[PDB]
Amino acid sequence: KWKTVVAIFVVVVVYLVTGGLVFRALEQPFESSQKNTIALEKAEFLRDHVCVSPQELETLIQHALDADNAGVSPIGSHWDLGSAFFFAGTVITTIGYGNIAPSTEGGKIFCILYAIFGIPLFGFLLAGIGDQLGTIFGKSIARVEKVFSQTKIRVISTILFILAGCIVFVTIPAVIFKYIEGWTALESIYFVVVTLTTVGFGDFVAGGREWYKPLVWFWILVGLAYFAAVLSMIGDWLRVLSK
Amino acid sequence: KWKTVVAIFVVVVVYLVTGGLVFRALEQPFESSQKNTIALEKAEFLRDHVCVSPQELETLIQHALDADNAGVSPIGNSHWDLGSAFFFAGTVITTIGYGNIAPSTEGGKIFCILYAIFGIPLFGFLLAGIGDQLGTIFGKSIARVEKVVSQTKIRVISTILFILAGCIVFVTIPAVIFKYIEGWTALESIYFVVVTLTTVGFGDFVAGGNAGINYREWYKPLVWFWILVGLAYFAAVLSMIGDWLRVLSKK
Ligand SMILES: CCCCCCCCCCCCC
Ligand SMILES: CCCCCCCCCCCCC
Ligand SMILES: [K+]
Ligand SMILES: [K+]
Ligand SMILES: [K+]
């Protein structure tokens, strides 16, 4: 119904204005602080190093930023067979971190075609594992239904399936990332959330051991496939309940 | 069937190795060039400015990089205004997650986790709602083509017609606008639109991000509204093709 589509649109637009005001309140005091710190650090450099002009300073900062935008660290390979395989998977999963991004005009042209004829291909694999996990969930709810309202059985089992994935694909990998990457308890859970939601800001990237990067993508594939199966299972029920 | 899941997995793993080798061939010569450029530029700075030590140089570069990671441009003398913060909220919700604007505060990250978990499925409803309305537009248009040959051939000619319709209204027309407003190349404009609608969002190109550009107030929310209708249309097209394939799988 169109009366409900407008109602959801009102909720979403309210959620963005509300959410936007919460983020502003949480990040603008930090942004204001960092704006003052870089201005004071740049002024301190020119104050101590008299031989440097303010324009020659900006030229170097711009050169350091241009190198960073290309993917080269201006401190002290990102396209090796392993890293380029992980970047390909970063496009396919729609995560798109941004730490590694095509800089060549030709590299962009291929990235456009690789996403268009690649993201639906991943849909098939995610749907396949989705159909397989459905068989596991369906048999488990039928086992509880053989013992135990149908809605109460469905809600209890689903929450357990959700929490099962929250330990195996959310908690356990965040613990591994806290030890390997050396991030904080927050940053590890934050990265896992930002990765599995396919948001992928790129502010935290795993592998930034040889078996690490391919095993990280395999975790993404199973991790996504599991929650995608639960979301499919809940959706299918809602449309059945709608009829 | 599990026999087909393994078959798709083989194709996907082949597609990543193949694709990865193509990207390496296209980007490693450029990466090798930029690696030499920054090394020569840093050495030239210390050569001309004798009074600067190599360690004091790295300290400044790291300070400039730390400011950039926070979202503050280390060039010359806000990203969280009611306008930009609304667009960032939408960037989380749509799962695009560009990167230019990202939570740096511990508390901001905690809220970002909760805002995505209890927000991305809410967007699902909105995209499903518009997708349920577009299906009515598609079903009537397929019936109009069928009024003018097998049903599958009609569906193929109708699907091509629907994709081409969206490729002009949500892909070509907005890329043309972005080429004039942002000032990007003909490639970068189409590339940004593709990277945006695919919900990939690298953040290498972000609409309403140039400091030296004096944008209008209606720009950023209308750009997000384009994302909504744009995504909704291609999501409805994808839901339609999938539905038919599962129907064909049974029959
Ligand atoms: C073929 C595209 C794959 C990426 C989309 C998966 C979305 C997962 C959303 C999880 C929901 C968590 C609240
Ligand atoms: C609940 C938000 C879902 C966002 C992901 C949708 C992906 C759409 C891809 C369309 C196909 C383009 C080739
Ligand atoms: K992204
Ligand atoms: K995404
Ligand atoms: K993304």
UniProtKB/Swiss-Prot annotation, chain B:
Q: Which domain of life is it from?
A: Eukaryota
List glycan-bearing residues.
77
List every stretch annotated Selectivity filter 1: 95-100
The residues the record assigns to binding K(+) 3 are 97-98, 201-202
Changing residue 238 to W: reported impact? Reduces norfluoxetine inhibition
Cytoplasmic side, ranges:
131-156
Q: Where does K(+) 4 bind?
A: 95, 199
Coiled-coil regions listed: none
Q: What's the reported outcome of changing residue 244 to A?
A: Reduces channel gating by mechanical membrane stretch
Q: Outcome of mutating residue 162 to A, per the record? A: No effect on channel gating by mechanical membrane stretch
The record gives the effect of mutating residue 79 to A as: Loss of channel gating by extracellular pH
Task: List residues binding K(+) 1.
Answer: 95-96, 199-200
* Cellular location(s): Cell membrane
Q: Which residues are listed for K(+) 2 binding in this entry?
A: 96-97, 200-201
The function of this protein is: K(+) channel that conducts voltage-dependent outward rectifying currents upon membrane depolarization. Voltage sensing is coupled to K(+) electrochemical gradient in an 'ion flux gating' mode where outward but not inward ion flow opens the gate. Converts to voltage-independent 'leak' conductance mode upon stimulation by various stimuli including mechanical membrane stretch, acidic pH, heat and lipids. Homo- and heterodimerizes to form functional channels with distinct regulatory and gating properties.
- Note the subunit structure: Homodimer; disulfide-linked. Forms heterodimers with other 2-pore domain K(+) channel subunits, such as KCNK2, KCNK4 and KCNK18.
Query: Which protein family is named in the record?
Result: Belongs to the two pore domain potassium channel (TC 1.A.1.8) family.
UniProt remark on domains: Each subunit contributes two pore-forming domains 1 and 2 which assemble to form a single pore with M2 and M4 transmembrane helices lining the central cavity and M1 and M3 facing the lipid bilayer. The transmembrane helices are bridged by the selectivity filters 1 and 2 carrying a signature sequence TxTTxGYGD that coordinate the permeant ions. Up to four ions can simultaneously occupy the selectivity filter and at least two elementary charges must translocate across the filter to convert it into the open conformation.
**Annotated protein name in UniProt:** Potassium channel subfamily K member 10
The opening ranks of the lineage are: Eukaryota, Metazoa, Chordata, Craniata, Vertebrata
User: Gene that codes for this?
Assistant: KCNK10
